[PDB]
Design an enzyme around this catalytic site. Structure first.
Site, PDB file in Angstrom:
ATOM      1  N   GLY A  14       0.878  -1.244   0.197  1.00  0.00           N
ATOM      2  CA  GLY A  14      -0.145  -0.050   0.103  1.00  0.00           C
ATOM      3  C   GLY A  14       0.936   1.404   0.212  1.00  0.00           C
ATOM      4  N   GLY A  17       0.128   8.767   2.373  1.00  0.00           N
ATOM      5  CA  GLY A  17       0.811   9.919   2.900  1.00  0.00           C
ATOM      6  C   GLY A  17       2.112   9.621   3.674  1.00  0.00           C
ATOM      7  N   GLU A  90       9.261  -5.680  10.800  1.00  0.00           N
ATOM      8  CA  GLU A  90       8.480  -6.879  10.801  1.00  0.00           C
ATOM      9  C   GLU A  90       7.287  -6.727  10.065  1.00  0.00           C
ATOM     10  OE1 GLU A  90       6.926  -6.888  14.942  1.00  0.00           O
ATOM     11  OE2 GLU A  90       5.975  -8.620  14.828  1.00  0.00           O
ATOM     12  N   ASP A 136      -1.265   8.761  15.908  1.00  0.00           N
ATOM     13  CA  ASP A 136      -2.145   8.551  14.814  1.00  0.00           C
ATOM     14  C   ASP A 136      -2.813   6.977  15.065  1.00  0.00           C
ATOM     15  OD1 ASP A 136      -3.814   9.006  12.490  1.00  0.00           O
ATOM     16  OD2 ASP A 136      -1.918   8.382  11.156  1.00  0.00           O
TER      17      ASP A 136
HETATM   18  C1  LIG Z   1      -0.525  -1.649   3.668  1.00  0.00           C
HETATM   19  C2  LIG Z   1      -0.666  -0.853   4.650  1.00  0.00           C
HETATM   20  C3  LIG Z   1       0.321  -0.064   5.223  1.00  0.00           C
HETATM   21  C4  LIG Z   1       0.131   0.715   6.149  1.00  0.00           C
HETATM   22  C5  LIG Z   1       1.314   1.310   7.008  1.00  0.00           C
HETATM   23  C6  LIG Z   1       1.262   2.804   6.971  1.00  0.00           C
HETATM   24  C7  LIG Z   1       2.269   3.498   7.641  1.00  0.00           C
HETATM   25  N1  LIG Z   1       3.388   3.043   7.656  1.00  0.00           N
HETATM   26  C8  LIG Z   1       3.615   1.971   7.548  1.00  0.00           C
HETATM   27  C9  LIG Z   1       2.760   0.943   6.916  1.00  0.00           C
HETATM   28  N2  LIG Z   1       2.790  -0.351   7.224  1.00  0.00           N
HETATM   29  C10 LIG Z   1       3.699  -1.132   7.825  1.00  0.00           C
HETATM   30  O1  LIG Z   1       4.543  -0.615   8.577  1.00  0.00           O
HETATM   31  C11 LIG Z   1       3.420  -2.676   7.871  1.00  0.00           C
HETATM   32  N3  LIG Z   1       2.264  -3.152   7.193  1.00  0.00           N
HETATM   33  C12 LIG Z   1       2.006  -4.345   7.066  1.00  0.00           C
HETATM   34  C13 LIG Z   1       0.646  -4.637   6.267  1.00  0.00           C
HETATM   35  C14 LIG Z   1      -0.270  -3.776   6.326  1.00  0.00           C
HETATM   36  C15 LIG Z   1      -1.788  -3.852   5.839  1.00  0.00           C
HETATM   37  C16 LIG Z   1      -1.906  -5.198   5.294  1.00  0.00           C
HETATM   38  C17 LIG Z   1      -0.901  -6.127   4.931  1.00  0.00           C
HETATM   39  C18 LIG Z   1       0.364  -5.855   5.651  1.00  0.00           C
HETATM   40  F1  LIG Z   1       1.270  -6.659   5.532  1.00  0.00           F
HETATM   41  C19 LIG Z   1       2.756  -5.463   7.575  1.00  0.00           C
HETATM   42  C20 LIG Z   1       3.737  -5.087   8.207  1.00  0.00           C
HETATM   43  C21 LIG Z   1       4.178  -3.670   8.616  1.00  0.00           C
HETATM   44  N4  LIG Z   1       5.512  -3.360   9.103  1.00  0.00           N
HETATM   45  C22 LIG Z   1      -1.134   0.647   6.885  1.00  0.00           C
HETATM   46  C23 LIG Z   1      -2.054   0.097   6.315  1.00  0.00           C
HETATM   47  N5  LIG Z   1      -3.226  -0.103   6.818  1.00  0.00           N
HETATM   48  N6  LIG Z   1      -1.931  -0.837   5.059  1.00  0.00           N
END
Ligand SMILES: Cc1cc(-c2ccncc2NC(=O)c2nc(-c3ccccc3F)ccc2N)cc(N)n1
Length: 274
Positions: A14, A17, A90, A136
């Site tokens: 994804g 911002g 992670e 947040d």
């Molecule tokens: C793909 C996305 C990104 C962010 C995200 C936003 C800001 N900073 C980092 C983000 N993500 C992460 O750190 C992060 N995301 C995932 C993840 C999130 C949603 C679906 C599947 C996934 F594997 C797994 C491990 C992570 N360490 C939030 C959402 N809801 N979805």
């Protein structure tokens, strides 16, 4: 030593911002990782590393909350590029963020919302203990490790070092922001976090957020669109007190009668996620 040799890049998970996040694998042990890229010009908050290195605030904050505690996403490594920073985080597998989970399931049963909310509270208390304020807290910034029934906080990119003086800057989510931010562009760390926690708990038990517009936030009148117990409604209304000083402390939230007899994370995965 280089980024390309250490990690195998997978599909884009994804973007927004916060930057761009990719699925990845650490080449050495095949450990699942998330690779986050953020452009230097797009960085909302900058931080200082002890050795003087200029880094995004998230790198400083995630290093401060680094321990064996599974409630916060672990920062495994980071890299500076000419125009960007890359963070290796992670990645639980299988995983689902709380926003997608709620979208698919609708309003959560109170037993499940209690287990999830309790783990979010333990994770936020750990941040505050480490001198970190998330800023947040929302369904999109919470990941569910589906096999273990463990929740993790993600996205510390709008965060700050926790302080006892007023904050006059904010770059989190408006619909989770308190009435003092909307009205005066001022808020204190703990009480603003408790307000966002009331928005989150309402979201869990009702399947949607309580307020959409600035005027609803300021009025702070809570309407329940779903059947919610009297004890749960009381906790929500307490977290959403208009006066910041009327909001409960984390201790008052965790001692609330609605919060008693929480399921263990593994019991949560067995009953509700399997
Ligand atoms: C793909 C996305 C990104 C962010 C995200 C936003 C800001 N900073 C980092 C983000 N993500 C992460 O750190 C992060 N995301 C995932 C993840 C999130 C949603 C679906 C599947 C996934 F594997 C797994 C491990 C992570 N360490 C939030 C959402 N809801 N979805």
């Amino acid at each position: 030593e280089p980024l390309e040799s250490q990690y195998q890049v997978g599909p884009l998970l994804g973007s927004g911002g916060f930057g761009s996040v990719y699925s990845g694998i650490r080449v050495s042990d095949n450990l699942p990782v998330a690779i986050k890229h953020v452009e230097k010009d797009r960085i909302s908050d900058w931080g200082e590393l002890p050795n003087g290195t200029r880094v995004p605030m998230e790198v400083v904050l995630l290093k401060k909350v680094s321990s064996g505690f599974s409630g916060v996403i672990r920062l495994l490594d980071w890299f500076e590029r000419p125009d960007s920073f890359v963070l290796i985080l992670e990645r639980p597998e299988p995983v689902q963020d709380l926003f997608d989970f709620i979208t698919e399931r609708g309003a959560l049963q109170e037993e499940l919302a209690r287990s999830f909310f309790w783990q979010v509270l333990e994770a936020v208390r750990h941040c505050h203990n480490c001198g970190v304020l998330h800023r947040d807290i929302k369904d999109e910034n919470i990941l569910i490790d589906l096999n273990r029934g463990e929740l993790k906080l993600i996205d510390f990119g709008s965060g700050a070092l926790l302080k006892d003086t007023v904050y006059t800057d904010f770059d989190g989510t408006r619909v989770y922001s308190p009435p003092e931010w909307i009205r005066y562009h001022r808020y204190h760390g703990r009480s603003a976090a408790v307000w966002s926690l009331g928005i989150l708990l309402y979201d869990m038990v009702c399947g949607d957020i309580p307020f959409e517009h600035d005027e609803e936030i300021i009025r702070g009148q809570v309407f329940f669109r779903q059947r919610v117990s009297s004890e749960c409604q009381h906790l929500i209304r307490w977290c959403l007190a208009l006066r910041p000083s009327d909001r409960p402390t984390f201790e008052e939230i965790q001692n609330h009668p609605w919060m008693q007899d929480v399921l263990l994370p593994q019991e949560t995965a067995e009953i509700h996620l399997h």
